[PDB]
Amino acid sequence: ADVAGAVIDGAGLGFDVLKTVLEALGNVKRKIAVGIDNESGKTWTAMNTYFRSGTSDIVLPHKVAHGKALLYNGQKNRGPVATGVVGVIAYSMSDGNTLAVLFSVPYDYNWYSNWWNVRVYKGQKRADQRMYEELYYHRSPFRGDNGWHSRGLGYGLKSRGFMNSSGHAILEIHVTKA
Ligand SMILES: C[N+](C)(C)CCOP(=O)(O)O
Ligand SMILES: C[N+](C)(C)CCOP(=O)(O)O
Ligand SMILES: C[N+](C)(C)CCOP(=O)(O)O
């Protein structure tokens, strides 16, 4: 089966492949499978993931051509620590701007919920705490509510994505030319 870390045909991205990626992480309380389909017309080059909470043992897929999707994952920090998997993925686009994707899969659903977001930043900006705070608090993230959400991104692009509500999370995003 396709694995986290791979770049696949973007038409092959879907819940089945992400479920498999999520299952392959085994028995961990909070974990996420992330798939982002690049149909933007331009190549993305990975910069970094800012992990606010949690970690990954997967290399952030380096080059993602138009027509390809990346597969990735993250998991809570090891041991009983009551924290989840929360972070921002940042890819450079060939126009000199940055594609940023927020994911948040909190430890405690009594206080918090799943959220995600997608935004293009002007210039080359590495993912960091400031970007996490902007995307989570101020830039209208979407709830992981087991439903799809669309939004135009500017820069000739639009996004359509889905995230479920539970702590074994899947996040599937398609970035297409608007
Ligand atoms: C809930 N949060 C997203 C604001 C902070 C991080 O959550 P957690 O990793 O402590 O659960
Ligand atoms: C602060 N806390 C993480 C122990 C519980 C949640 O409080 P709040 O951040 O929902 O106000
Ligand atoms: C994410 N948010 C800051 C826009 C809404 C509040 O969500 P949460 O932190 O209470 O789960």
Author numbering: 2 to 179
From the paper:
Fragaceatoxin C (FraC)11 is a potent haemolysin of the family of actinoporins, defined as a group of ~20 kDa protein toxins produced by sea anemones. The lytic activity of actinoporins on biological membranes is enhanced by the lipid sphingomyelin (SM) and by lipid-phase coexistence. Here we reveal structures of FraC corresponding to four different stages of its activation route, namely the water-soluble form, the lipid-bound form, an assembly intermediate and the transmembrane pore.
Suitable crystals were obtained in the presence of POC (a compound that mimics the lipid headgroup of DOPC and SM) and the detergent dodecyl-β-maltoside (DDM). Two molecules of POC are bound to each protein chain, occupying identical positions to those of the headgroups of lipids L2 and L3 in the crystal structure of both, the transmembrane pore and the DHPC-bound monomer. The protein–protein dimerization surface and the non-covalent interactions observed in the dimer resemble those between residues of the β-core region in the transmembrane pore (rmsd=0.4±0.04 Å). The structure of the dimer reveals a localized and notable conformational change with respect to the monomer (water soluble) at residues 14–17 of the N-terminal region. In contrast, during dimerization the residue Val60 of a second protein chain displaces Phe16 from its original position, leading to (i) partial unfolding and increase strain in the peptide bond of Phe16 and its neighbouring residue Leu14, (ii) a displacement of 4.7±0.1 Å of the Cα of Phe16 towards the solvent and (iii) further structural adjustments of Gly15 and Asp17. Second, the serendipitous capture of a dimeric form of FraC exhibiting a similar protein–protein interaction interface to that of the pore, suggests a mechanism initiating the self-assembly and metamorphosis of FraC.
